[PDB]
Automatic annotation (TrEMBL), chains A, E, F:
<feature type="domain" description="Human immunodeficiency virus 1 envelope glycoprotein Gp120">
    <location>
        <begin position="1"/>
        <end position="94"/>
    </location>
</feature>
<keyword id="KW-1032">Host cell membrane</keyword>
<feature type="glycosylation site" description="N-linked (GlcNAc...) asparagine">
    <location>
        <position position="187"/>
    </location>
</feature>
<dbReference type="GO" id="GO:0019031">
    <property type="term" value="C:viral envelope"/>
</dbReference>
<feature type="region of interest" description="V5">
    <location>
        <begin position="390"/>
        <end position="398"/>
    </location>
</feature>
<feature type="glycosylation site" description="N-linked (GlcNAc...) asparagine">
    <location>
        <position position="180"/>
    </location>
</feature>
<dbReference type="GO" id="GO:0019082">
    <property type="term" value="P:viral protein processing"/>
</dbReference>
<keyword id="KW-1133">Transmembrane helix</keyword>
<feature type="glycosylation site" description="N-linked (GlcNAc...) asparagine">
    <location>
        <position position="143"/>
    </location>
</feature>
TrEMBL record, chain C:
<feature type="region of interest" description="Immunosuppression">
    <location>
        <begin position="41"/>
        <end position="59"/>
    </location>
</feature>
<feature type="coiled-coil region">
    <location>
        <begin position="100"/>
        <end position="128"/>
    </location>
</feature>
<feature type="disulfide bond">
    <location>
        <begin position="65"/>
        <end position="71"/>
    </location>
</feature>
<protein>
    <recommendedName>
        <fullName>Transmembrane protein gp41</fullName>
    </recommendedName>
</protein>
<feature type="domain" description="Retroviral envelope protein GP41-like">
    <location>
        <begin position="10"/>
        <end position="128"/>
    </location>
</feature>
<feature type="transmembrane region" description="Helical">
    <location>
        <begin position="1"/>
        <end position="15"/>
    </location>
</feature>
């Protein structure tokens, strides 16, 4: 009957804001240094229905920018390997090559001859090759840009990080155990911070993620579009154990006034290729279930899991990081199956030291070695597939765009600005 | 705690929003404040929050509702905005749904509120 | 719209000012964000604007004019400030010209408004 | 001038601090963009604004808005302080009183909030 | 009778603030990315008189700082030409010299011999000169400081720039035709933003400016003082077409890991001096009118237009930029006249590649060449004259201090802070 | 009887905030450009008792951070002496070595032989020593960092510094003479800014400080702990005149494109060691008084003043920077006495040019020479002693942690936030 103004009204709008990181010499501990509340309260909003859309979610963009930002900042004060773009002379080890080069010393009027083992992937043949003989070579991606050494004292091990909303905003979490990305959700709950999200960098297979509560969920922006990436959230993990067996002996040298360069001085014992053992029975079960789900989404079609096409190494292999060692594994032996609706697997892996992260050109990183052999037990929790696009559907491993990885953990969350000012009718005037 | 009783019967929510509003008291790190562009972004977020709070407070003050979480006004309700005589509004309807209902009329209502206070202010200086 | 009816008297303009204070409310209530020194400049400008607005609001509150765009006060006008008995002030003189007229006594009037309102507050606390 | 009549007594300071505040009106280079100092000043400034607004919000919520002195509707409970109108406006000063009733500040704030809630509810219901 | 407090009072004070830029890979588009209002409303303040002063205007200083900072930030990431400060062996071209030098490459232990055409202005000898034979020179400005290559993909072409006031401030614009720059203005308007101002960098002649509404306007801080620069706003433009006819062939090399250096590899055909053709009749009429105006301001004096004195090249020539090509034109043939109160002109022009902008030392810029020939037309709207200071007045072309140029566009505008709080007597009492 | 809310209450709490500097080219004048009030006002609080604690005072931390940051920012745009990390063929000055080296020039394909006199402390041998003959050495700290030259045009002369509180805070000052540093202060006042503090950098002896008003004051966090540093505030100064008698002739060279390196080209006349003359009788009286006060604090003990133990040079000598010269003086001759409760002193001093400030490793500074001899007169207003920790107490000169210097001036001050909102009972309700 009469207008009335209320303040403190529970009304919100979709909005974008800079969420601040908080977690309970790691870069993810220096950043995200804000502590998290013990037992953060989740308030369930009864009868509230909210439209979620995991794609076009600004939280994913913020996480992408924050992740690369920390990596770039963390590499800023480190040693630039500009003195090491010189002629190497490599002659095989009595995959890996025993290169030799004249590196600079702290004194400008001095040089030092250095013998270092470099992976063949990290080198470019400057001169014609020569089998056992020593040929001239150069470090890869030198001409593109200077190579910055990742600091040995700074570790990039992922830790669970929570993205908290600033004051005046809130986060809405969908609590539906089977909910495709873009659509309404009935079971919404308000929160101040996300769950513990580990920013694990990988391709093809999502590692150390969060398992789906219900079945295996297939989320894709446009399934009928063959350009979009399908994200498969698994409801059960699969164990994969990665390992570099080589027993490295790591040396160091001074390439400047306080600039230390760490390289693989030697390998003790036999030289063997790195590999990943994934549990066979669990993998076969997982692929069968994913095939049935894809058949449900793609009726009257045979579901073929094949190897990726012949692109670059960074995009045709399961790439990941284990204690700073950068593995690229050939998962062709895994995606080698077919579902018709009508004892470990060993995966060879190459290892690189000169890395071009985030699909960028002109910013390379040198990942120094680690003495000894290396092992990492990671849980595969999700897959990144791409439909080739016949009466048969071909799904290949995908990835490369790290956005999807962040989205794989941020599909639940939405950011909303609170509009406390509201107007409603009442039964009385001002007077 | 921000959105307690959301989607929850504006009558009940208003029984809570005034109680919670006073209870909530919502609104008003050297690495993250000196290294990189983190600090500038925190400052931008905080300044934007202050600006939005001051915008809401200014709108309350212009309408004569300064310092009040609930304030009746001299603007009578026009049925052209909504034709529901408290049956759904304080009954089956929620604050979010109600906001969706009068999303198109809101600016118009503000003008009337604004206009009303003008008259009162003029009257305030004419009766004295 | 900021300076509408400027230099157009104040007796006639006063209606336009009451209208502007609702239509305009007030002026104060990417590459240019985190690249170079332009972001810090924008932050300084915004913070200074907020500070000036809060200074004006605090002055209004201290005088008992809180939440009022027009407020009569209990301070009688002293002819030592101006000897125009509404003849040219609201008849022929503009707000800018009037500001020039009493630029030297504005602070004194602020003191009188403060003292008067302070006494009022004490009288109210004694009466209750 | 900020802490004028500190120590002394609450009564003298209360009247004076109102006139003192009536006068102080407290609450509201290369360094602008050289080094971290340009950031630091803003953190010194923005934070101050926030603190000021927080106090104002309390005044808003207790109906003390635009009033340096504001009698409320909450009766005083002797459990907070045994003395009353003897030293609290006699020999005691504001610092001692502050650290005396610092134990119950949240309780007082909740009671004032409840009183203003009831006041607003009565205002809308009795109108 | 009783004090009354008003808020929203239309009263303002002269104040300084940081005006934010706006405009409808250009540096002026990246910066000034804020869009402008379609049809920006101009409110005329009736019966308002305001004291404008084009001199001592903080807007001019702010625009000077913004232009300087934008240029520096744009040249910040571009290639530094430190490796190219080496001995050059230059031997004339079968003005321009064919210089040979050993540049660096992406490999620290490699060099590359490079033949590049350099203007003689950009070179200073190291030992002797031998007419026909070659001799050893170096680039100028190396001894003073380093040299940064302007990014070839980043263009500094001016666009209309609007300087918008922030919240709580307004820009008063003086509409009085024939406003002499410092007196009171009896016809003002209020705006949020200025008109489209092109930040054109030039000397002597103002190009692509705003024409005066009335007749030609002579504005100076103190006409009786001979050290101040007279700014002449023309009410009619004069067409000047400036061209570099040399048909260059532009090469490039890598002087580092991703550092590309662009130089003039060759000139195809004949080598000819660059020149500016200015329309003769329009120029003669313009100078006659300017002389008449100066005679009005300087009675009983013969008005002599003579060439500048024998200073440096940057201050004795019409300097300007055309597609990043830096011309310096000998405009003595234009200012070669005399007014007594009682068919194109061709101007030769030199071109430089190593530029010291903003009258600064310690910072130099290398402007890369452009393949092909260059032409451009720039309307002349303003003149920067200096009175020599006899029964005769000698006016020479001036400039060098860039603020005057932007002052020629910002003479109209004045920034004012609004003071909404006011006090007035009323019969009303609080009671 | 009824709750009442007051605003503007004079109540405060201990709080930490960033204090903005103030002072009535010099780095301390460039920074702290905020002017100070004429006749700063001090308001004494009657019957107010406040707990001060000069240790764990955030003002000391802020002054430490600000001094280090200002020193670093002042050295940021200066010349990096990376080209001088080369072999030096040092013979002998006809303590000081006559070192020859091939420095670089503005051209990357040129070198210049340079003869420079370097102190032996600033040099580390590379191969053997030969008495009369020359040997190859290198500059110290060449193999740890790049040495930045302190700019000759930028002076670090201390000036009085006033640290002021932002709005909403105040600085309480304790007026109680003989205040022992941590107890309650029964005579306090409020101020906006502190007294003029000269940020003088020194060890062992505090120079150009503030004299205690009463007697000599001994302040230490825990006197019975032998690890803490005792600060002795003297109530009477002692004159010390430090001088470098060498008559230097200072040359300069270009080590790059606009990089100027200043070094001691020659010494005219005799070479003599620098020295400090401290007034003998005043020093003996001062040490007798300090011994008496320590005996009061340490009853039944003989008070022995002995020289520091055999640590590094920077921590076993009185270190200071008279003019632009960094002197390290062997003050064992001063602390060579014993107090039993039952005519100048000449101190030799070494001088360094390569300086490591605040115990930092990885950042070194080259202090250029000042042509001619150098002399300075400072007043010893304080001592930094350390109890060795028998029936006898051994007190040695201390220092090295520069906070103890700036805690010697900021002991009086305490930052407090004002809490203007308060509550109190009254005799009436709102009604
Ligand atoms: C999915 O999640 C798993 C589990 O978190 C990850 O696997 C872990 O990865 C971390 C880091 O990559 C491993 O932590 C490292 O372990 C090394 C070996 O630890 C064993 O041996 C040492 C012997 O010293 C024992 O003390 C220890 O208890 C273990 O028995 C350590 O040597 C490492 O320390 C070195 O690095 C750290 C920084 O990382 C430094 O601070 C140290 O000083 C030292 O230099 C380090 O602690 C962990 O062991 C792994 N666990 C398992 C079970 O594999 C996966 O990596 C993750 N998935 C992906 C893709 O990353
Ligand atoms: C006063 O105002 C006049 C009028 O604006 C100015 O003169 C004009 O200046 C503009 C800008 O320099 C000229 O416009 C055109 O600029 C194009 C931009 O080239 C960039 O992009 C290409 C794309 O790859 C790059 O390769 C290149 O390096 C640049 O980064 C040019 O491409 C235009 O070239 C001409 O040839 C092409 C084909 O080669 C044609 O297709 C075009 O249409 C065009 O004819 C051209 O340079 C414009 O030509 C100038 N004249 C006129 C009459 O507009 C004055 O410069 C200004 N005063 C001052 C002092 O600056
Ligand atoms: C993960 O999801 C899959 C698919 O929903 C579950 O596998 C099915 O489980 C049901 C219940 O026993 C069986 O009837 C089906 O035959 C299984 N396969 C398929 C393709 O549906 C699996 O149990 C889930 N994981 C859990 C619960 O841990
Ligand atoms: C990974 O191993 C797979 C399986 O061999 C390779 O895929 C094909 O291998 C066959 C030979 O077995 C070749 O003839 C094809 O050219 C290969 N196609 C590609 C490029 O996938 C593959 O070469 C190996 N490399 C990857 C993709 O990691
Ligand atoms: C899907 O995979 C199946 C096998 O899992 C493919 O079947 C093969 O068909 C080819 C025809 O040339 C035969 O040579 C092979 O023997 C079959 N099996 C094997 C071992 O691959 C089938 O071609 C695939 N379909 C698509 C379109 O991907
Ligand atoms: C004096 O002011 C009047 C406005 O009061 C000017 O007239 C119009 O002004 C508007 C806005 O500035 C323009 O859009 C119109 O084009 C103007 N009309 C005409 C006919 O000029 C007038 O030009 C001003 N005159 C001077 C000399 O300043
Ligand atoms: C620009 O101003 C000049 C005067 O400085 C104008 O030239 C005069 O124009 C009038 C016509 O109104 C002629 O009678 C005069 O002979 C011209 N010369 C002089 C010296 O007055 C010119 O018309 C103006 N042009 C524009 C476009 O406004
Ligand atoms: C500085 O302090 C010393 C020690 O307290 C003072 O020296 C004493 O002065 C008194 C005179 O008041 C003499 O009777 C004593 O013999 C002196 N020595 C001692 C050990 O007490 C000195 O006077 C003070 N000076 C100032 C300027 O305050
Ligand atoms: C809904 O969400 C709540 C809280 O997140 C959860 O406990 C429950 O299992 C979910 N399922 C329902 C009831 O929809
Ligand atoms: C997801 O389901 C919704 C229905 O809620 C449907 O509209 C949409 O097409 C599906 N795909 C996505 C991920 O949007
Ligand atoms: C993508 O989504 C649109 C939505 O309208 C749909 O029409 C289309 O079939 C989908 N697939 C492709 C390949 O566009
Ligand atoms: C894939 O399976 C087929 C079954 O015929 C086998 O022949 C082939 O070796 C397998 N290849 C991979 C990549 O595992
Ligand atoms: C030291 O004390 C003497 C004597 O009081 C005084 O003249 C001089 O200015 C003071 N300052 C210094 C450091 O010499």
């Amino acid at each position: 009957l009469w207008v009335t103004v209320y303040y403190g009204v529970p009304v919100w709008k979709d909005a974008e804001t800079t969420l601040f990181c908080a977690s309970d010499r790691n870069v993810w501990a220096t950043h995200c240094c804000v502590p998290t509340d013990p037992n953060p309260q989740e308030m369930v909003l009864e009868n509230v229905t909210e439209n979620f859309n995991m794609w076009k979610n600004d939280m994913v963009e913020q996480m992408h920018e924050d992740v690369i930002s920390l990596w770039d900042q963390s590499l800023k004060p480190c040693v630039k390997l500009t003195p090491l773009c010189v002629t190497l002379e490599c002659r095989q080890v009595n995959e890996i090559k025993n290169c030799s080069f004249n590196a600079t010393t702290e004194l400008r009027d001095k040089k030092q001859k250095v013998y270092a083992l470099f992976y063949r992937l990290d080198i470019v043949p400057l001169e014609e090759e020569r089998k056992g003989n020593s040929s001239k070579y150069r470090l890869i991606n030198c001409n593109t840009s200077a190579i910055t050494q990742a600091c040995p004292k700074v570790t990039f091990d992922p830790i669970p990080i929570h993205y908290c909303a600033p004051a005046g905003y809130a986060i809405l979490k969908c609590n539906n155990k089977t909910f495709n990305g873009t659509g309404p959700c009935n079971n919404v709950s308000t929160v101040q911070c996300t769950h513990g999200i580990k920013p694990v960098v990988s391709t093809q297979l999502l590692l150390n993620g969060s398992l789906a509560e219900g079945e295996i969920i297939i989320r894709s922006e446009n399934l009928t579009n063959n350009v979009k990436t399908i994200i498969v959230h698994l409801n059960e993990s699969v164990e994969i154990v990665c390992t570099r067996p080589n027993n490295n002996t790591v040396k160091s040298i001074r390439i400047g006034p306080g600039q230390w360069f760490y390289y693989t001085g030697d390998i003790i014992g036999n030289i063997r290729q790195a590999y990943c053992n994934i549990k066979k029975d669990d993998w076969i079960r997982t692929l069968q279930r994913v095939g049935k789900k894809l058949a449900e989404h793609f009726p009257r079609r045979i579901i073929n899991f094949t190897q990726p096409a012949g692109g670059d190494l960074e995009i045709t292999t399961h790439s990941f990081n284990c204690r700073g060692e950068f593995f690229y594994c050939n998962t062709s032996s895994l995606f080698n199956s077919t579902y018709n609706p009508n004892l470990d697997i060993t995966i060879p892996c190459r290892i690189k030291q000169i890395i071009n992260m985030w699909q960028r050109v002109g910013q390379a990183m040198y990942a120094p070695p680690i003495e000894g052999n290396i092992t990492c037990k990671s849980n595969i929790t999700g897959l990144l597939l791409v439909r080739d696009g016949n009466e048969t559907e071909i799904f290949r491993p995908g990835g490369g765009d790290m956005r999807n990885n962040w989205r794989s953990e941020l599909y639940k969350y939405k950011v909303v600005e609170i509009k406390p000012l509201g107007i409603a009718p009442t039964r009385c005037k001002r007077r | 705690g921000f959105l307690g009783a959301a989607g929850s019967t504006m009558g009940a929510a208003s029984i809570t929003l005034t109680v919670q509003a006073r209870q909530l008291l919502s609104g008003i790190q050297q690495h993250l404040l000196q290294d990189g562009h983190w600090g500038i972004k925190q400052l931008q977020t905080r300044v934007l929050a202050i600006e939005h709070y001051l915008k809401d407070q200014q709108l309350l003050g212009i309408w004569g509702c300064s310092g009040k979480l609930i304030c009746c006004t001299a603007v009578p309700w026009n049925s052209s905005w909504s034709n529901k005589s408290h049956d759904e509004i304080w009954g089956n309807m929620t604050w979010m749904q109600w906001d969706r209902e009068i999303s198109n009329y809101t600016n118009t209502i503000y003008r009337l509120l604004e206009d009303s206070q003008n008259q009162q202010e003029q009257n305030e200086k004419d009766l004295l």
